[PDB]
Amino acid sequence: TGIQISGKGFMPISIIEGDQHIKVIAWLPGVNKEDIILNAVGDTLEIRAKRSPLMITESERIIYSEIPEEEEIYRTIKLPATVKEENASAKFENGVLSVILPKAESSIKKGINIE
Amino acid sequence: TGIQISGKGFMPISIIEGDQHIKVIAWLPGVNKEDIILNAVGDTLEIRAKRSPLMITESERIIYSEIPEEEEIYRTIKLPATVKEENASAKFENGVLSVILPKAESSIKKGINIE
Amino acid sequence: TGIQISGKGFMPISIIEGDQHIKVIAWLPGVNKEDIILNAVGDTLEIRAKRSPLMITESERIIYSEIPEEEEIYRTIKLPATVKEENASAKFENGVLSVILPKAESSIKKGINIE
Amino acid sequence: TGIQISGKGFMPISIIEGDQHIKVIAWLPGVNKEDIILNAVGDTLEIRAKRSPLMITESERIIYSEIPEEEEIYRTIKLPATVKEENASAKFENGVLSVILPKAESSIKKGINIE
Amino acid sequence: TGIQISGKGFMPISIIEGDQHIKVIAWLPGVNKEDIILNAVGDTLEIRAKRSPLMITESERIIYSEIPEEEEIYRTIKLPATVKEENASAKFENGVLSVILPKAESSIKKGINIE
Amino acid sequence: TGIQISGKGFMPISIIEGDQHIKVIAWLPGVNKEDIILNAVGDTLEIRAKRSPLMITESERIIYSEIPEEEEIYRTIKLPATVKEENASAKFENGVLSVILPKAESSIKKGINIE
Amino acid sequence: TGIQISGKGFMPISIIEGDQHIKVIAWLPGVNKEDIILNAVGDTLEIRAKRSPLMITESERIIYSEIPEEEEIYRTIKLPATVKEENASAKFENGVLSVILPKAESSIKKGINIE
Amino acid sequence: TGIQISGKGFMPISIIEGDQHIKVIAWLPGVNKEDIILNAVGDTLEIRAKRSPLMITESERIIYSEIPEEEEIYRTIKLPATVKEENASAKFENGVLSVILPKAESSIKKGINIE
Amino acid sequence: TGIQISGKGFMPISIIEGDQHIKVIAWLPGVNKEDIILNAVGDTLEIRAKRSPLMITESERIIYSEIPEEEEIYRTIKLPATVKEENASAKFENGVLSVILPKAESSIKKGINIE
Amino acid sequence: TGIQISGKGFMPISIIEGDQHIKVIAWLPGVNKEDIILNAVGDTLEIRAKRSPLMITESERIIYSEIPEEEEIYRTIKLPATVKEENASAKFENGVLSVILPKAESSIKKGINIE
Amino acid sequence: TGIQISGKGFMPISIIEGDQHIKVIAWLPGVNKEDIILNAVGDTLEIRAKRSPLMITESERIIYSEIPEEEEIYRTIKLPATVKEENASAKFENGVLSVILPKAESSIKKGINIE
Amino acid sequence: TGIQISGKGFMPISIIEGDQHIKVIAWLPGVNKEDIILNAVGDTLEIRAKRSPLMITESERIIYSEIPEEEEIYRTIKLPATVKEENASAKFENGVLSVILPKAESSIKKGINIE
Amino acid sequence: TGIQISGKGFMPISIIEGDQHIKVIAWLPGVNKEDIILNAVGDTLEIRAKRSPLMITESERIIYSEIPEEEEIYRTIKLPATVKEENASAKFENGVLSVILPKAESSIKKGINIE
Amino acid sequence: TGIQISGKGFMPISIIEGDQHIKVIAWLPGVNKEDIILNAVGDTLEIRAKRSPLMITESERIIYSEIPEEEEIYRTIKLPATVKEENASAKFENGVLSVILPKAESSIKKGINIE
Amino acid sequence: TGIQISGKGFMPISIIEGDQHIKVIAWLPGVNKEDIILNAVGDTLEIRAKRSPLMITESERIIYSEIPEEEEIYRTIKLPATVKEENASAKFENGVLSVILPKAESSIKKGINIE
Amino acid sequence: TGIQISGKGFMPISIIEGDQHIKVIAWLPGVNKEDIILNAVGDTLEIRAKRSPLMITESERIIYSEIPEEEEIYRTIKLPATVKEENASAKFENGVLSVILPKAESSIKKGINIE
Amino acid sequence: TGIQISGKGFMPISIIEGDQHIKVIAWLPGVNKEDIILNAVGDTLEIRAKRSPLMITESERIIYSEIPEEEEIYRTIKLPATVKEENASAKFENGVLSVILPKAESSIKKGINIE
């Protein structure tokens, strides 16, 4: 049942499990597609990215703000199954990274019939 | 000094104030550019948008999730100055809406010299 | 000693350990034998099922109820030994699923003599 | 409005009220159809049954368990209406007993019109 | 399910329910068989008795005591079924009164079969 | 002033002290005269008895009960004076055992006059 | 070091220990010299007395009172040495009983020299 | 009655209200006259300035300090009356800025006579 | 390590320690250069000054204020080294007094080499 | 009723009382039969022993341990009856010492009959 | 660093780790050498045994006891290294079981030199 | 196991128990050898002494003090064995009284062999 | 994400993770380079060392100390990746041990591209 | 007014101040005159001594003890006046060290007359 | 008895006091011998040093760390005696600085004899 | 800044500090001018006096009292400057002692000019 | 028994009652004999006085003070007896006013004899 999330910075994760794969959704609003580093192996995925901070002309002042300032953020995740890093896909749109990880064959649960 | 935020759903705001305008940044990760409705007048801006929920094949199950499910979200904001809705600009990239509101002339603080 | 239960919905589990196998008992009252999905591999078993809700004619009203309404329920379990999914058996009677999982050879503790 | 449940052992009840009858649902997972004793009269129903305990070979040990051990369990219920014990029906499938109790004529609320 | 005990003085009760009767056991240690008053009707039984207090010669003093002094004690009990006061029996031995109350016909639950 | 009570089971004691003896009253409701074992020596008395439990036909069920179930009960008591076990008397009626213990000569307080 | 006081009613005690005796002072205000019963043996002294209550003509009412009403009062005391009841003296004046108890020979501590 | 202060950094304010004007005093110790920016309009005044930090030769170390380090500080204030930014005066001496704001004509309360 | 501050009134201090001297910074906003009294000797410095209060025409009222009213304020400080009062310098600008105190020769720590 | 245990070190005791003797069981796991010292007299028994500590090669380290380290342990017990030290027996097997102490004749409670 | 103990009953464990093996000490006082079952595999050892309860003639009564009554007890342990079940040794003396488990080659940490 | 200390004043005790005697150590700093009174009998020892208070010339004042002022101090001790007062020894040096009390023959525990 | 530290004694750890290796920093002030034992295998590293205690001539006394006295200290660490013990390097300077552990090939996360 | 006590071990101090000297009393029961080390200088006195521990034959056991075991004890005291170490006297009797310290001339307060 | 420590950063100190000197031990792990500044005078010593921070290639990330980051650290200590800065020695090895400070003659306590 | 008051009894102090002296006021109501002892030296003043207690004829009783009874009272004060005991003056009128202490030359703070 | 004190300012009172008069003591330290106003009538006395405040040259500052500043103080007291204001006396010395009030004849308790 094991899933271990860990890292720094704001990054709402979501783990979807299918029969033959695992989907991982992450919220990286403000982060630039090319600032994201994605790599995984075995049963752990690591998402690390950097989102630059709000640039303000000397004239402006931040009257108010709920957006976290930290620039470097990431998460290493322990998936509940080993996967094929080799066939992983990933899309990043509207600040949302979505990673598809095919389940490794050795981690594909096989059925049991009832009678 | 008045700034009144209010509405429903997750939407980290940020208000930047310059001498002749007001910048408003909002985090709408996952929201579709054309699902955003932006309108303002006087001293209040309203950002309302809808982000569709994570679609999962019947086969998948959400093993874990930190992403809020609510679909319809918005915020009406009371800015600390009246603005020219007419000349407002807005960009939406990487899940981040950024609105530029020119300060109305009547709300432009004028200087006072010290001696 | 590790055993990790996890999932959603009401489903009292029971894990029995023998020398060469592991028995797992689950309470799925109201669930339909063919609505149960059983599969396992390595050291983890997954029981997922759906029990339809109490259907009431428009005329009736639920005057009182201790029965949980949720329809989709499941549990993935981490057994304390690897098993042969291939030879697992399972019976479902009187709302009680009982799964027999033969211990994998590599997980069969071997004796040590005292003198 | 009176409904009085009472007895011993785990047995999630559910009382459905219709215009001319009362349905009572009980969760008796693991209990054997012929170990259930059902009888009622006036405005009270009594469900008493016994579910045998998990039998384990001397070799096995209960590594973990959420299933209550008590064998003899029951509930006497006070229904919100008198009923015809004589015409009561009952089905027991998938650990779920469902009893239909026709409302006694003297307990059938009659309508009142508004104008 | 209703059973209402009430009265004054120490008198441990016990209510046993059979299919066609109700047994009631009461602890009246020190009480004299002929100081007991037993009467009942409908669904309520009343046991009232008086136990004289420990008589001590002027010479003696009660060095210590866990025995309640109150002399007049009783309990009126609401049984879970109407009974035939007419056929009630009662035995009193070793400070223990035991009353047998035949269930009234109108209170005898009738069976319901399952299929 | 020493009096030490100790043992198991419900047994309200009462110790009466006279000039030349000690009376001990015990509540053994439900206990059978011949199931009581009484013996003492020096300054300690021991009362041990067994009261059989309420026998119920398979048909009956204990709907409610304030009577303790434990069968074997007893108490060893340290009296405030040595006594003549040899001349102790004892009566048991209506669930009440009453023991008379003649004070030993060596424990008979002798008077002191005031002037 | 043992001294055990016990009894009922208000009776401030005081124990004085000498080398060859033990003095006991008791406050029995309002008690009548001839209502006092004094006796002791071995290592325990017993003081029991009765002070009659304030008699008031029907005309009077107790507007206020700090004097305890209880009539029968006493105390049995465990002295730190065995004594010769036989040679005990006692004086009672101004509501104060004072008892002199010669230490028994077997309880007279004997000296040990230091060097 | 409205007065809204808001901003960042240490800056004790004081608002004095006259019949035809409003005085505002601010403590900007350590701040340089030409580092102060003063501007206002309508009913809000904004004071923003920057005080450089204590410069210490590499040789020195701050053994102790109650002086806040923040460099950029400011406050935007909502005055209880609209004012003529145009005729505002301001003096800055001994770390104290004092601003005189003539009340706008439309905000000059007019008298009411009592009889 | 000793540094003892003490006195009355608001006066944020700051003590900087160099190898051959001690710098002391104090916030005296609103205080007049010539109202400051500075003197020191041995290892203690004393700063005492008076700042006049905000003068308000009878017409004005203090609508709000965070500026402390007390007029006479001061602090006597125990420096962590004896100093040469004789060569102390002092500057007072923008409400900030800064005192330079040459360390006394006898208080100049001398080096120790490590090998 | 008196039983006084006291001493140091871990040593679960158990006192069994028969009519003519007293059994005392003690848990001395790891203690060597010949390291046990047993002696008693009157109404008190004393069990004192020493268990050597776990010897570990310099190479090993105690990764974890629930076994108390103390070496010298013992208990002096006050039995509820005087005994014949002279006829006491004792067996020590599997780390369990079991002592049989014949009750002294003077401590054998004699019977009292009830009628 | 992982070590997982788990099971039922009183059984103080101790785990000693050497470079090439693991020692496990267990306190099974009162347990019979031939009632102990020892087996292990991979990185987990299981110790299960049964100690019969104190047998008492009908005449005796357990006046006092700190010895746990449970008969069947055991523990499955997760060792911090895989081991060779095949070469495990075990001695049981004075209620103390001591098991020697040779570390598996694949679990023997290899050195790293510092410079 | 009984040991009862009691008395007044500061006097740290220490009781050592041998096979044939009992040693008692007491801290009587400042007390004068000839101000100590030692006597005992049976199973109780009594140590009473008086230490004069610090004498100060009128000129001096007690600037500070942790030494208790009370002059008369003592303790009566209940030893865990009867002793021969007759053969007791005692040494008093450096404010430390040490008493040797030979155990009485009747209190000398006799051995019990194990097999 | 798993990292498990464990051991005894003061030893501030620091784990740095690179793409192809893992660095581990440990503070072993006062420890002697040749008193350090470093070994690792799989995914766990073990650092064990001994620092001798401050030697003080009989003449000296430790007036004050924040340095922990314990001599033998160590930590076994679970790294987040398997490593090649074989190619580990290590430097120890200024009380700081620094270990470089090359990541095992099987633990080297591989990239995933986004589009 | 300064007096600073500090050190380890039990040692009740007492400081008496006269016009021309300072007396210091210390309780060193059990300490040997020649195990005491006394030295002082300026305004601080240091008392350090060692009292050997109670020696017990292997046969004896410490049944009870209020005497602190620590062997090495001491206190360094800061006197409220500088003194002439040179003329200090000291007596040690009955476990009580008493030191007389002549006040240094420079610390002898001189009088002031009132009128 | 005075010892005053003060400064910033992690630096476990230890002060050893001899008859003619004072030893000071400090833990400066990671600090470079030539980055340490040592100087003292009178009765105060000052240790100030700087330890550079862990340098990490852009590729690495600090997965975990118990090592404080602050670079500049120091402590000024008030020794309990004046010393000869001139003859102070100092060694720095294995992150441990050890300073020897000869006591000043004027601070060398001189003896006092007891009689 | 140091001022240390200390002593016993009620004596409200007041310390006034001038540029060249220190005034000390003390409330000694009821104390007799010739019962006051005043002396000081260096930086500490000592005021000690005795006020006799209210003398009452045997006939009178103190119905109520807020006046402290203690007779001997005093305070030793640490002044913030050394003084010339030699030139101290003192007046005592209306229960108020007032002492004038000329500051010692070495304690006279010297000025520092600001520019 | 009535005595009512009331007023403002610090003024410790004391009421002494004799058979024929009442003495009242008041602490008015610092108050001037001629600033005291004393008058009474019936059963109430009133003491009102004013003590001027400590006058300090501009040069001095109150470094510390426990003396209350309030100038005007007083107390009106309700005596437990009516008195002859006419014959009252009063002395004021050393800050202590002492008033003698002759009891009025009507308030002089007269005796009652006991028999």
UniProtKB/Swiss-Prot annotation, chains A, B, C, D, E, F, G, H, I, J, K, L, M, N, O, P, Q:
This protein's UniProt keywords: Chaperone, Cytoplasm, Stress response
sHSP domain mapped to chain residues: 4-115
Main location: cytoplasm
Source organism superkingdom: Archaea
Role noted for this protein: Chaperone that confers thermal protection to other proteins.
GO cellular component, one term: cytoplasm
GO terms for MF: identical protein binding; protein folding chaperone; unfolded protein binding
An annotated GO BP: protein complex oligomerization
Subunit (UniProt): Homooligomer of 24 subunits. Forms a spherical shape.
Similarity-based family: Belongs to the small heat shock protein (HSP20) family.
Cellular compartments annotated: Cytoplasm
Name of the featured protein: Small heat shock protein HSP16.5
